[PDB]
Amino acid sequence: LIKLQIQAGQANPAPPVGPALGQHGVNIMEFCKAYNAATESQRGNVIPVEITVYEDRSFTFALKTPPAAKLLLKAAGVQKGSGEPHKTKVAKVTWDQVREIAETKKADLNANDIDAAAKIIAGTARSMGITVE
Amino acid sequence: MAKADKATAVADIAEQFKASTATVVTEYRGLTVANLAELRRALGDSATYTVAKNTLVKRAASEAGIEGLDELFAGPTAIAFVKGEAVDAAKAIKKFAKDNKALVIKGGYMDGKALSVADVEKIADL
Amino acid sequence: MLIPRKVKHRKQHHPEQRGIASGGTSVSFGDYGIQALEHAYITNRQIESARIAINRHIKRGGKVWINIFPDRPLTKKPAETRMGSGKGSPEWWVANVKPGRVLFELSYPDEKTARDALTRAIHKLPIKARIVTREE
Amino acid sequence: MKVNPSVKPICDKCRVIRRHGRVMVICSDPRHKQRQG
Amino acid sequence: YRQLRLERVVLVGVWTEGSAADAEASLAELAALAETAGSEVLEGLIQRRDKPDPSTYIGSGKAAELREVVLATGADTVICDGELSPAQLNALEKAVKVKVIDRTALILDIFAQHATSREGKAQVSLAQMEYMLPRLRGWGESMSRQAGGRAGGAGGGVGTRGPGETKIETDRRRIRERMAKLRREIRDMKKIRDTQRGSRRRSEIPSVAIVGYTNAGKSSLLNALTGAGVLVENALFATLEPTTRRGEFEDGRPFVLTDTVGFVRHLPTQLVEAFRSTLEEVVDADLLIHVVDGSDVNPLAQINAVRTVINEVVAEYDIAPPPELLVVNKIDAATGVGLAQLRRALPDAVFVSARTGDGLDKLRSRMGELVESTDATVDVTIPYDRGDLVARVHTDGHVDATEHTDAGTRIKARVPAPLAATLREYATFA
Amino acid sequence: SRIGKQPVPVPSGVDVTINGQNLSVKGPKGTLTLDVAEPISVSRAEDGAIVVTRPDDERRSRSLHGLSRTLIANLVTGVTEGYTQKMEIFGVGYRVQLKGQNLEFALGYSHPVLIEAPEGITFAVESPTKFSVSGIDKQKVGQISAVIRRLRRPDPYKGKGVRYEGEQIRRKVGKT
Amino acid sequence: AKRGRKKRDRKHSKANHGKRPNA
Amino acid sequence: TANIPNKLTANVRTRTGKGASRQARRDGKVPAVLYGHGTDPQHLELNARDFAAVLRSHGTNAILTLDIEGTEQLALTKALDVHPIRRNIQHADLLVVQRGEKVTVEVTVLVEGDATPGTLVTQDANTIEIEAEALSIPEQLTVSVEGVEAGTQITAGQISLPEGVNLISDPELLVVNVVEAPSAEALEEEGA
RNA sequence: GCCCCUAAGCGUGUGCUAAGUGGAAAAGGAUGUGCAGUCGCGAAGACAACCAGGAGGUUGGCUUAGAAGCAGCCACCCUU
RNA sequence: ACCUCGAUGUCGGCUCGUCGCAUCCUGGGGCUGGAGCAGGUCCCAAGGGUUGGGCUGUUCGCCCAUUAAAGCGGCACGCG
Ligand SMILES: Nc1nc2c(ncn2[C@@H]2O[C@H](COP(=O)(O)OP(=O)(O)NP(=O)(O)O)[C@@H](O)[C@H]2O)c(=O)[nH]1
């Protein structure tokens, strides 16, 4: 029903989580601690989670790899995306780094080609406006 | 739906068809695109799966001994090429098919001639 | 708004209509143009309205030419009077259009927007017209 | 509903037809349905 | 036919009361209006009298002097700083041998020139012909055009049956016919728009109306606060059709800025009836922004003009006076003492440069605080499952303090009475 | 022509009779009858099928071919499975009550409203807030379903009324 | 108006050949 | 470059005049006249359909081969009298042209490309004159307007001609002008 | 002019019209219909139909309480 | 300027009508910026109805008290 992103470092963020998924009837109190215990080794890196709830609100949390935007921008050090994607340069990235991010994301991707996922991440970067080569 | 691309698709099919020592043709009607990921991860040691358009596969079937599968070119084509021999890949292809139930093996080809589903499954289980 | 700055005679016979245009029948200044299929007396008011229509449709560029000019004088007698006492004073200015003669010319990169502007203009006009272009 | 001698499919959903000898328009939005007369 | 054409101008004015400053300002604004109409000002004559000249608005010797002046300058029109009778018009015409136009006729022709669409054409035509009827004899002797003729009236031997004489055709007969029909539509459009104005009133959305002097930045304030561009400003030396658009206060609460036509000293009442279309906006308005040019050295004249017109309008419907915010625009044009000469008399006015927004922050704060919010101050705590209610608070509500706790979202906000009743259960003071 | 050419299968538990121009079809549910347009010919295939053909390829024949074909198809489907159209009612205080061969709606009117099931159709009720109408003829089933629909005028503002299960009716808003 | 229109239209006929007296 | 002369048939017109010519146009034969240095001209009937087909395929200066009474005759159409209301080809002028004969011909000038975003193109002369042997006449020429900056003038002398082709027309003639795009206010000013 | 009023043809052959058009009318609207001529895709499966594929990269970035694919803005790349 | 000058007697009010619908009310619908009430607009509809007074010669016009409503036009600006 709901899929958001959260960083293992903390829990129960007000705007991102407060009115986001608690609105749909999710046991945030237990879910946040379960997610933290499951993925605390990642420290403060944001990680995507998708919640599957049953009739009785019994919940299961599925984890995916950290966002490709963060993986592309942190290397240069910028912690945010392009305000006007493709219009303002924000960082520089290498083709090897793009392919490594693609291989990491292949779990997130629905894809089965590593080079094609590399193309995926190259698009994901240059559309924001990041030099890729 | 392209015409000039007919020859390109036929050539791309035929090159890998001859490169593969043996090939098996199935219908994959039922599996979400994701399940192909697990299928390829399981068969990556000895075989590779790929989809194709029967409209051109039938035309290309006259190049080699897959002509015996003329009656079998129905449903959504799924070629599971095997690098070498047929058992090495069949032993896993048959088990994955029996598990997921989204694949039905209908034809095969080896030694320049077609072999029946019974032959393919016997090689798989042997 | 177009008005001849001077005219040798200010009270002329009615421009005759019969015949087909022997000149000005080929678009020459722009990509598309408006051709006329029947006679009329296009006046400066209608010409100005059609021009405003085209310019307001395009809104940012292109170029428009008016291959016709209203210069023939036409006079109406004073209101509520009888027959006699000479011709009236010149009130409205018309151009004697004939079938074939091209009226407006337009050059704009976008073919469909150009056609739309030309359609708006032909609607504002009082005559049956059609869009044509340079090619045979 | 509108009744004008000019009927226009004023949006992508609008559909023109000829019913009982009279043209008209239908749309998922009743604001647009109109007849020719 | 029957139009107006100040070809070139030679102003004439009579100083009856007040001061030479008042007389010169009046004649100068008259010249400004004439220039706007297009005539070129050649010279401006002023005659000082204790009371007007009910003969021809000036002395006979002065009229002869003006005839000589006009012949010498080759002028074509004489514009008089006043509203005069047909007899005075005819006297001046026979003294000067040229077309003679007045302030009222000039303003009416300016309106005819400006008006583009809407009911404005009908309003202008009715005002012009209602002003022409009293001067039907004056303008009717200063015909102009006409194509000459001879009488134009000869039926025939009557016998036992008088001429049809059911003349339903006359100068204004149509104007009369027309306006009689078109008043109904004037009211109907008002009412159909009011159908939604009532819903605007249902919400906190208040009505704010700009009351300003003609060509007094009246559209600059709109383009500064609302931001929306206004075609030809929809506000200038003479606009007819008022406009309006939805802006926001200092706090954020929505409202409508209503740009309206400016005013002139003693605007002809024939046009105050067309102004009614924008001057019911003053009664509808929750707030009034009284704008005045900052470069003026005698602001009080225009201030009193606007005040008296608005008083005349309000007296009709006995509506309580709305809040009034005095605004001085184009402030940079004057000196410090130039601003002081206005500030000392009227210190509460806010001086804002619409060209750059200097002080616009204080202007927004003042107007937002003057337009008191029609909300309710409510503190509440709602569980996390009511994220939709928190979203509705964000959308329609007025958040003052939003925080979160395990129990729910502690929100202190100003909210409408319906929603306050809806979520009264979780109120801290339940 | 297209659709009109496709022959109509006749399931095993079916009976057909192509008598003259008229067609009669019987089965477990009941009997039904139909007629055909003169410029369209009908015949019985040797393999349990109904064949419909035309002697020309004109406008009327082309239009009528698919018509007649689907008419026969619906006839044969009715004589075996008939049709059943669902319904449902929204609005607090709204109810439906079965009175045997007739049905009652309480729709907020001053007087509760009675609708009588005509010959060859039955009203079944699963609850006060939902029901169904069943018969052997699609035309009659749909006509009665629409007549039930017409009872309460559409209420976009709140949506209360009788509508089919799958209908997703428009929904505007009122100020207060 | 109808009177005049019909009076004229009587002119287009097989035995008149497009010309009738008085228009 | 070269082109194959297009084969056409042509029957000598039995009788002439307005009536004969318009009856021929009525029944589908466009009348035309073949003249040139080859003595007194002759008058021909050409099939309008295929004639128009070849004309639209190969421009207005295509090279023809008339099977007049079977006798082959190379020719070049010089001009077409075309009605201005219904674009019906009412007359054709054909010029007997022998192999390798140098002729003066009128050739269109196409424009291809686009200027800077704040710019507009304005072609000014469709036809330019050219001298070339009968069989080497291009159907059209092209002028590049890619990446052009600000005010730009392209004249007949600034285009790239084919080989075996000479520019009869004056080289300074302006054929394309690229100018800054008009504004809306400039549009309104136009025609004032 | 030739079905009866009303003298002579409900004449012969080939097609068009559904409007009693015939047996009044404009700008303009439109998917009525016959013919002719074009250009795109098309058994290598054209359009339709049923969809098992149509999922995911991923909040594509900024705006975001918030726009997670479809409150908005920028690119708008990508397999399987 | 076509009939009427060896005569076609004119405005308003009265009596008596009759016809058109381009509908003021009553009746049936569509859309609504149609919560309800009450509105706005358009379509169909001519069966019946459509007040009395003050000023005005008055047509017309303004006002008072009602009313579901106080419709608009043709008939020698119906009818001496
Ligand atoms: N004094 C002053 N006036 C300003 C300022 N900004 C805008 N305006 C007014 O804005 C007007 C802009 O033109 P507009 O209002 O559209 O009408 P207009 O110029 O008066 N037309 P016209 O010349 O015919 O009177 C200027 O004439 C000026 O009156 C400002 O800073 N100071």
TrEMBL record, chain E:
Protein family according to the UniProt entry: Belongs to the TRAFAC class OBG-HflX-like GTPase superfamily. HflX GTPase family.
Gly residues compositional bias, start-end: 149-162
Domain Hflx-type G: 206-375
Keywords tagged on the record: Cytoplasm, GTP-binding, Magnesium, Metal-binding, Nucleotide-binding
Cofactor: Mg(2+)
Function: GTPase that associates with the 50S ribosomal subunit and may have a role during protein synthesis or ribosome biogenesis.
Chief localisation class: cytoplasm
Binding site for GTP: 212-219, 259-262, 329-332, 353-355
Record Pfam families: GTP-bdg_M, GTP-bdg_N, MMR_HSR1
Record's subunit section: Monomer. Associates with the 50S ribosomal subunit.
Annotated Gene Ontology cellular component terms: cytoplasm
Species for this entry: Mycolicibacterium smegmatis (strain ATCC 700084 / mc(2)155) (Mycobacterium smegmatis)
Region (Disordered): 144-166
InterPro entries for this protein: G_HFLX_dom, GTP-bd, GTP-bd_M, GTPase_HflX, GTPase_HflX_N, GTPase_HflX_N_sf, P-loop_NTPase
UniProt-listed Gene3D superfamilies: 6.10.250.2860, GTPase HflX, N-terminal domain, P-loop containing nucleotide triphosphate hydrolases
Record lineage: Bacteria, Bacillati, Actinomycetota, Actinomycetes, Mycobacteriales
Metal-binding as UniProt keyword: yes
GO molecular function: GTP binding; GTPase activity; metal ion binding; ribosome binding
Gene that encodes the chain: hflX
NCBIfam families: GTP_HflX
Subcellular location: Cytoplasm
Residues involved in Mg(2+) binding: S219, T239
Protein's recorded name: GTPase HflX
TrEMBL record, chain G:
Pfam family, one: HR_L37
InterPro entries, sorted: bL37_actino
Chain positions covered by the region annotation Disordered: 1-23
Top-rank taxon, per record: Bacteria
NCBIfam families: ribo_Myco_bL37 (NF047428)
Name of the molecule in the record: Uncharacterized protein
Organism for this UniProt entry: Mycolicibacterium smegmatis (strain ATCC 700084 / mc(2)155) (Mycobacterium smegmatis)
